[PDB]
Amino acid sequence: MVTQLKSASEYDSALASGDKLVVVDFFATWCGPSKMIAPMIEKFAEQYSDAAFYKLDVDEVSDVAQKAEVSSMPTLIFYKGGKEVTRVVGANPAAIKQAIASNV
Amino acid sequence: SLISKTIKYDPAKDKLITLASGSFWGTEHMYRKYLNDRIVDSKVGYANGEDFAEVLQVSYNPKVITLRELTDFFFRIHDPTTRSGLFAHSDADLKELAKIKEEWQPKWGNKIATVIEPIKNFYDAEEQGYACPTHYLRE
């Protein structure tokens, strides 16, 4: 499962995780590419147990989106220790999978 | 053709403008959410400037809405400093779009990279496209 973040509060207390990798899908419901990356991140969430996967609607929580400087969807951001390690912009599932594997 | 084969369009009453804001998902989402009552028809496709851009083609009645209003909207819905294009269907409209861009320059810190060109081609199923830039109404 991929847990949706609903406010800046939920987002912050999801970064406070420890060594466990935190993956966040910044998405838009109108955006085609963003919409079609969803089932792919669901599968990676199933395959990579040691990583906590989240999704955030950029229209819903614009403050987090702007603060993480997301200007395109999808943007998958990777966090370890409450800090950004890397990101993948655009709907390339193979690229996203690599970033997961390379980070836990 | 420079006109989509599916669009509602009357040459004796209507006009056309072809808009690229970086993703036709965003371009369609924005015009259909705010100006759907004021446009004739709207079709997503790929436009060529006189390499295809993802675009929305807007058919409209000048006595209902002007190009100026449609373009003012365009510069509010996406970030044109950064993929961003306006494709004119007449030479009169080309010079008006350029005028509008000039007027919008100070508000965007004079960094508008929007391309203004005559329309060269338009398709629908011509069968990047990896991501949509952020689309929302700026204030």
From Swiss-Prot, chain A:
PROSITE patterns in the record: THIOREDOXIN_1, THIOREDOXIN_2
The keyword Disulfide bond appears for this protein: yes
Record keywords: Cytoplasm, Deoxyribonucleotide synthesis, Disulfide bond, Electron transport, Golgi apparatus, Isopeptide bond, Membrane, Nucleus, Phosphoprotein, Protein transport, Redox-active center, Transport, Ubl conjugation
Cross-link for Glycyl lysine isopeptide (Lys-Gly) (interchain with G-Cter in ubiquitin), residue positions: K67, K97
Annotated membrane topology: Peripheral membrane protein
SUPFAM superfamilies, per the entry: Thioredoxin-like
Site (Contributes to redox potential value): G32, P33
Gene Ontology biological process terms from the UniProt entry: cell redox homeostasis; deoxyribonucleotide biosynthetic process; endoplasmic reticulum to Golgi vesicle-mediated transport; glutathione metabolic process; protein transport; retrograde vesicle-mediated transport, Golgi to endoplasmic reticulum; sulfate assimilation; vacuole fusion, non-autophagic
Compartment(s): Cytoplasm; Golgi apparatus membrane; Nucleus
Catalytic residues (positions): C31 (nucleophile), S34 (nucleophile)
Domain annotation Thioredoxin: ranges: 2-104
Cellular component terms per the entry's GO annotation: cytoplasm; cytosol; fungal-type vacuole; Golgi membrane; membrane fusion priming complex; nucleus
Family in the record: Belongs to the thioredoxin family.
Protein name per its UniProtKB record: Thioredoxin-2
Organism: Saccharomyces cerevisiae (strain ATCC 204508 / S288c)
From Swiss-Prot, chain B:
Domain of life: Eukaryota
Pfam families assigned to the protein according to its UniProt record, in alphabetical order: PMSR
Keywords of this entry: Oxidoreductase, Phosphoprotein
Record-linked InterPro entries: Met_Sox_Rdtase_MsrA_dom (IPR002569), Met_Sox_Rdtase_MsrA_sf (IPR036509), MsrA_MetSO_reductase (IPR050162)
Gene Ontology cellular-component terms listed: cytoplasm; nucleus
Reactions this protein catalyses: L-methionyl-[protein] + [thioredoxin]-disulfide + H2O = L-methionyl-(S)-S-oxide-[protein] + [thioredoxin]-dithiol; [thioredoxin]-disulfide + L-methionine + H2O = L-methionine (S)-S-oxide + [thioredoxin]-dithiol
GO terms under biological process: cellular response to oxidative stress
Gene3D superfamilies the record matches: Peptide methionine sulphoxide reductase MsrA
EC number per UniProt: 1.8.4.11
Keyword Secreted recorded: no
MF annotations from Gene Ontology: L-methionine-(S)-S-oxide reductase activity; peptide-methionine (S)-S-oxide reductase activity
Family per record: Belongs to the MsrA Met sulfoxide reductase family.
Purpose: Has an important function as a repair enzyme for proteins that have been inactivated by oxidation. Catalyzes the reversible oxidation-reduction of methionine sulfoxide in proteins to methionine. Also able to reduce dimethyl sulfoxide (DMSO) as well, with DMS as the product.
Further remarks about this protein from its record: Present with 3070 molecules/cell in log phase SD medium.
Protein name: Peptide methionine sulfoxide reductase
